[PDB]
Structure 1
Amino acid sequence: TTTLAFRFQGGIIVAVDSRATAGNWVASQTVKKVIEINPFLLGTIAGGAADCQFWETWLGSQCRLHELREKERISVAAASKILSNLVYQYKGAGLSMGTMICGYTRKEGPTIYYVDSDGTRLKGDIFCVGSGQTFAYGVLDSNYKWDLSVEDALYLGKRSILAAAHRDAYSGGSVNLYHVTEDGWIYHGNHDVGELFWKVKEEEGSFNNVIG
C-alpha cells in the first residue's frame, strides 16, 4: 500500500492507491482504501486487509452509536482514540494496521490522526502510510506549501500516489482522491494509473527515466 493525507489552507486532501498483494502475487487492483465513516469523517487503511477493513467498519458502528447516545457527531480525536484503544488491547496478537482518521468538526477544525497497530496515535498536518510511504513523502514534502489552492492540492496528492505507485512494487492500480472541507468530504474520482501515468508524463514533462 501507499496512502497519504495532508492539511492545508482549504481543508484536507486524502489520497490512496488501490492495490492488494499476497507476497509478489498482485491479488487486486481495485481495492477501496478510503473508508467513509460518515459525511464528515474518513479513514485510510494500510497493512493487513482484513484487520483494517473489519475494524474500521467496526469503528463506523461505534461512531454511529456515539451520535445516537450524545445527539452530536463524534470528534476526530475521540474517533481515532476508540480505534487506538481497540488495537492496543490486541497488542502483541499480530494485528497489522496503518490508518489515518481524517475529518472536520466545529470545535477541532480540519484534523488528521495517525493510528497504527502497535498503539501509536499522533495528531499532525502531513502523514504518509504504507509500503510506498517514502516515495509519496519525497514528492509531497518537496512541493508542499500551506497556501496551496484546492486545485493544486488535489493534484499534489494524486501526483504523490502516482510517484509511489510507479516506484513501489507493492503499490498501484488506481488513485482515489478525497477533499475534506467544513461542509464534509467530497469524492474527486478514481484515476487508473494505466492512463494517468502517460497523461502526467506528457503534460508535466516528468518521468524521464521511463522509455517514452
Structure 2
Amino acid sequence: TTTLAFKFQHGVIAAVDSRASAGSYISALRVNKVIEINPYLLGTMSGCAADCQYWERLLAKECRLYYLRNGERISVSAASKLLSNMMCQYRGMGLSMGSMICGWDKKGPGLYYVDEHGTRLSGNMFSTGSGNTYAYGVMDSGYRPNLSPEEAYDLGRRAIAYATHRDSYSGGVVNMYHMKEDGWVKVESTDVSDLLHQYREAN
C-alpha cells in the first residue's frame, strides 16, 4: 500500500494506492482504500484488510451516531482520537492498521495519522504503507504550501505513481480526493501503469 495526504493553500489532498496482496500473489488489482465517513470526513487504509475495513466502519458508525445525538458533525480531532482509543483497547492483539483521518471542521482542515499502537499525530503531511518512503521522496521534492489545486493533484498523482513503480506491494489505480471547505470531491481513479508509461514516453 501507499497512502498519502497533505495540507496546502486550497485544502487537503488524500491519495491511495489500490493493491491487496497475499504473499507475492495479487488478491485484488483494485480495492477502495478510502472510507467516505461523511461529506467532510474521510479515512485512508493500509495494513491488514479486515482490520482496516471493520475498524474504520466502526469509527463511521460512531461518527454517524454522534451526529444523531448532537445534531452536529464530529470534529476531525474527536474522530481520530476515537479510532486510536479503539486500537488502544486491542493492544498486543496483532491488529495492523495505518490510517489518516482527513477532514474539515470548525477549526479548518484536519489531518491525523493513526496507527494500531494508538499513535495519533496531527500534521500537514503523512504517508503510510509498504511504499510510504517512495511517496515521501516525490512528495517532499515538489511540495510548496502555495500549490494550485491542479498542481497538487499532480504531486499526489506522481507520488503514488512512483511508489507503485518501486514497491511490489503497491499498484493498480490512484484514488485521489481533495478536501475543501464544503466537503471533499473525488478527483480521479487513474491507472498507475498508464501514468508511468506517460512519464516514460516523455523521455
Provide TM-score, normalisation by structure 2.
0.98
1:208 maps to none
Aligned residues: 203
Q: Which runs of 4+ in 1 moved over 6 A?
A: none
Is 1:78 equivalent to 2:106 in the alignment? no
How big is the alpha-carbon RMSD for the aligned residues of Structure 1 and Structure 2?
Answer: 0.8
Distance 2:39 2:8 in 1: 19
Give 3-state SS (helix, strand or coil) of 2:45's partner. strand
Give 3-state SS (helix, strand or coil) of 1:103's partner. strand
Is 1:63 equivalent to 2:63 in the alignment? yes
Distance 1:88 1:194 in 2: 38
- Encode CA deviations 1:71-122: one digit per residue, 9 max, x unaligned: 10000000011100001000100000000000001x2200100000011000
1:200 CA drift (Å): 2.8
AA at the equivalent of 2:171: G
1:11 CA drift (Å): 0.2
Sequence identity, in percent?
Answer: 59
Give yes or no for contact 2:108–2:181 (8 Å, CA) kept in 1: yes
AA at the equivalent of 2:156: G
1:112 maps to 111
Segment drifting more, 185-194 vs 88-97: 185-194
2:187 maps to 188
AA at the equivalent of 1:139: V
1:132 maps to 131
1:46 maps to 46
AA at the equivalent of 1:160: A
1:209 maps to none
Segment drifting more, 34-43 vs 188-197: 188-197
Note the residue ranges of structure 2 that are not aligned, 5 or more in a row: none
Distance 1:154 1:75 in 2: 25
1:200 maps to 199
Give 3-state SS (helix, strand or coil) of 2:88's partner. helix
Distance 1:94 1:36 in 2: 26
- Encode CA deviations 1:151-187: one digit per residue, 9 max, x unaligned: 0001100100001000001100111111000010000
Distance 2:127 2:92 in 1: 24
Distance 1:104 1:154 in 2: 18
Distance 1:200 1:160 in 2: 13
AA at the equivalent of 1:71: G
Give 3-state SS (helix, strand or coil) of 2:201's partner. helix
1:142 CA drift (Å): 0.9
AA at the equivalent of 1:130: G
